[PDB]
């Protein structure tokens, strides 16, 4: 009765690893990266039922973030100076002028003796440092001299995060959840397919994710396993909290010539007091969002346990405080004066967080590398969203007392996850067949 | 803290467009709230209706309200309203609004009771 008929065209797909394209000031990389236009992109088709599964937390558009992001910044910033012949030892002093006491020690005035252009000269000149950079002998010398010989980023390679896009080849296309307050993973009965994703803008940082989404509706707690204290939880926010951050001290620049058309930034004197660099955070608005976080969070906990905020203890920098790029400088800020509250099951104008900076940046976990980013005159001000969070439980044995819970790092994998959730990529397979009354 | 207060006509007649308004006090109608409208019938349960962010509009309606049903916020006055068009007796019932967050309604006003009558 009836025959195999062969049907090409049939709107079916299955699961998709491939790569996406990117889209989109002259040095900005990410600008000079994908030159693929988007903007006109009314291109979302709704599909009615198919009722897509999503799972966050194996997608494969995160990762080829992870992969791409890094190679674009290693590329970008390999052809600068490679600043080996600095690694010398130094004649250092500490900077004691137009200080704070909070700046005592931080602040090191060192000379050493430096190449010139010709092989056979040496200039002694000078550069004021962090502590954080500068290593003690037993005289200091350069901390990346232990592992590596690093380079000086370029002053005209930009970093600013300005947003992509991501877009499917062609045989591929992209799924997107619309499921308002979708946690992550299964069923997701709301899709629609695109063939770009809206912009991400590739913000690096630890513990306080800055300048994402927001939440639709309401303050959206995930984690792969809530019940696993080895797992993250991501916090996204649905208001965001206004941080603003700078770097007192109007710095200046020095340029040398330690070879033939290789030149090093020194930091100069600095005009001014010295001063802390630090971040502002409203304290309401800082208690408002995380009640809320809580009062989500205890969907999971058992009947009214108590919760607490904590202290970020842990091993390092990347750890423990708060980084992120900004005005071009790297900032450790201490977040300690966040994460500090009990919330009883039963409750009824600005945080100062201290924060030190640095120029000898390892970037992403690694080894040796490191990139040097050279000074930035004048001062920085900085106002960014936080948009949310990466948290994780203690885990130990329940005796009521709930967990204290604290921010923290990771790898940039998790600051991406936070968007990409709402995306999956499958693969278009046009052919197939099915019985039909018919023969030739 | 957050005081929420309703008004608007005791009675409609059929046919006509409810409109009540639900002032907000003691908080910001822009905040990351669900703003919502629930009534209840005399001698009856409690039911909802709808609702709408404060940040972001995104509204939940009652499937059957739907076509009736508006929901809406002007920032300007800090206050949140229901609009019901076409009214019928079934819509006698005491209207109040409420501030949803997270699991359970914080804050409730007091409520109008609406007639429908000629």
């Known amino acids: 009765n009836l025959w195999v008929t062969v049907y090409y065209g049939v709107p079916v797909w299955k699961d998709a690893e491939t790569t996406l394209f990117c889209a989109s000031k002259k040095h900005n990389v990410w600008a000079t990266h994908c030159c693929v236009p988007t903007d006109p992109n009314p291109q979302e088709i709704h599909l009615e039922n198919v009722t897509e599964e999503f799972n966050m937390w194996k997608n494969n558009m995160v990762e080829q973030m992870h992969t791409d992001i890094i190679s674009l910044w290693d590329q970008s910033l390999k052809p600068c100076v490679k600043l080996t012949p600095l690694c010398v030892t130094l004649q250092c002093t500490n900077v004691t002028n137009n200080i704070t006491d909070d700046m005592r020690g931080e602040l090191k005035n060192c000379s050493f003796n430096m190449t010139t252009e010709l092989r056979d000269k040496k200039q002694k000149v000078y550069s004021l440092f962090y502590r954080l950079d500068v290593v003690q002998i037993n005289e200091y010398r350069l901390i990346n001299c232990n592992t590596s010989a690093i380079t000086q980023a370029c002053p005209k390679v930009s970093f600013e995060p300005i947003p992509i896009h991501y877009c499917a080849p062609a045989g591929f296309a992209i799924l997107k959840c619309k499921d308002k307050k979708f946690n992550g993973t299964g069923p997701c009965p709301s899709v629609s397919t695109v063939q770009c994703t809206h912009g991400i803008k590739p913000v690096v940082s630890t513990q306080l994710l800055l300048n994402g989404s927001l939440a639709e509706e309401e303050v959206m707690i995930r984690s792969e396993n809530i019940t696993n204290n080895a797992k993250n939880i991501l916090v996204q926010f649905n208001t965001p909290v206004q941080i603003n951050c700078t770097r007192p001290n109007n710095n200046t620049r020095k340029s040398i010539r330690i070879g033939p058309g290789q030149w090093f930034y020194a930091t100069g004197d600095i005009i001014g007091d010295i001063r802390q660099a630090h971040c502002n955070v409203s304290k309401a608005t800082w208690n408002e969002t995380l009640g809320k976080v809580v009062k989500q969070l205890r969907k999971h906990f058992g009947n009214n346990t108590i919760i607490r905020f904590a202290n970020s203890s842990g091993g390092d920098l990347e750890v423990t405080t708060h980084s992120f790029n900004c005005g071009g400088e790297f900032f450790y800020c201490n977040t300690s004066g966040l994460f500090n509250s009990t919330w009883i099951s039963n409750t009824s104008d600005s945080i100062t967080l201290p924060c030190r900076i640095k120029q000898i940046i390892n970037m992403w976990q690694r080894i040796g590398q490191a990139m040097y980013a050279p000074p930035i005159q004048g001062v920085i001000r900085c106002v960014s969203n936080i948009t949310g969070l990466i948290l994780t439980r203690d885990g130990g044995s329940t005796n009521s007392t709930t967990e204290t819970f604290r921010p923290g790092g990771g790898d940039m994998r998790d600051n991406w996850r936070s968007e990409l959730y709402k995306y999956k990529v499958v693969k278009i397979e046009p052919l197939g067949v099915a019985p039909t009354r018919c023969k030739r | 803290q957050v005081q929420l207060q309703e008004s608007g006509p005791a009675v409609v007649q059929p046919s006509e467009t409810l409109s009540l308004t639900c002032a907000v006090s003691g908080g910001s109608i822009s905040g990351g709230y669900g703003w919502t409208w629930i009534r209840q019938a005399p001698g009856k349960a409690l039911e909802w209706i709808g609702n709408i962010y404060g940040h972001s509009g995104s509204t939940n309606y009652k499937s059957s309200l739907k076509r009736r049903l508006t929901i809406s916020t002007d920032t300007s006055k800090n206050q949140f309203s229901l609009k019901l068009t076409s009214v019928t007796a079934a819509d006698t019932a005491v209207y109040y609004c409420?501030?949803?967050?997270?699991?359970?309604?914080?804050?409730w006003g007091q409520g109008v009771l609406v007639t429908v009558s000629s």
């Open positions: 409420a501030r949803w967050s997270t699991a359970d309604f914080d804050y």
